[PDB]
């Protein structure tokens, strides 16, 4: 059973930081990219970035909307994915999903449940 579990969600004050976690199992972690996607309430899914697989040296990319602000890293020893979000804004208030990705299907084929982040004064 492939499983992805997001955590770290909660209340953050405007300007602040939050580190999200994504614990995985059921597949060879290092063979895949991992992406972070978010979705503010009522709005579209927005791809934030990904970290590549072993074959690609675990390099990273980011959407222009969070490039600089957001950071993605992965822990291959424990098969956990992370997202460091900085300078939080109200427009960052959203559900945050981690998703298995890669150039096998060039898509996100497994998704976590998500964790919600609320940026409140």
């Amino acid at each position: 059973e492939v499983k992805l579990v997001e955590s770290g969600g909660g209340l953050v004050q405007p300007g602040g930081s939050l580190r999200l976690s994504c614990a995985t199992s059921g597949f060879t972690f290092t063979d895949y990219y991992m992406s972070w996607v978010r979705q503010p309430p009522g709005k579209a899914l927005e791809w934030l970035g990904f970290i590549r697989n072993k074959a690609k040296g675990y390099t990273v990319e980011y959407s222009a909307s969070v490039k600089g602000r957001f950071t993605i890293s992965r822990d291959n020893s424990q098969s956990i994915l992370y997202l460091q979000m900085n300078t939080l804004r109200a427009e960052d208030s959203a559900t945050y999903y981690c998703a298995r990705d890669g150039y096998y299907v060039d898509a996100m084929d497994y998704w976590g449940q998500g964790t919600s982040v609320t940026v409140s004064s």
């Binding site: 996607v37 579209a44 899914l45 990904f50 959407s63 898509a107 996100m108 998704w111």
Partner: protein, 112 residues
């Protein structure tokens, strides 16, 4: 900055009928290298996490019912649901993976 525009924004059908919806890409998502179209469809049932439906434009993902068909190429893509089931109620996103990833705005499917 590849922009995917989805149409309609929203639609409503009764169970059993056929629906079609459009994904329009700013740039060709067709890859010469492997002759693949770098577009995928996702289904997000309300209050649930997204689910991959189709990749490489037309390839159904494992476990996905045959009533979903992806078709198209280049900059013009489509998702057809032949025989909508109640389970299909969701927003459907197309996503380019030609260069990084970009989701369309979503097509919301209601059933009554």
């Amino acid at each position: 900055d590849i922009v995917l525009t989805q149409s309609p924004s929203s639609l409503a059908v009764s169970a059993g009928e056929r629906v079609t919806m459009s994904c329009k890409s700013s740039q060709s998502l067709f890859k010469s290298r492997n002759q693949k179209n770098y577009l995928a469809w996702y289904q997000q049932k309300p209050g649930q996490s997204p689910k991959l439906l189709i990749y490489w434009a037309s390839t159904r993902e494992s476990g996905v019912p045959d009533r979903f068909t992806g078709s198209g190429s280049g900059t013009d893509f489509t998702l057809t649901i032949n025989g909508v089931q109640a389970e299909d109620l969701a927003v459907y996103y197309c996503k380019q993976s030609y260069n990084l990833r970009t989701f369309g705005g979503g097509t919301k499917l209601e059933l009554k």
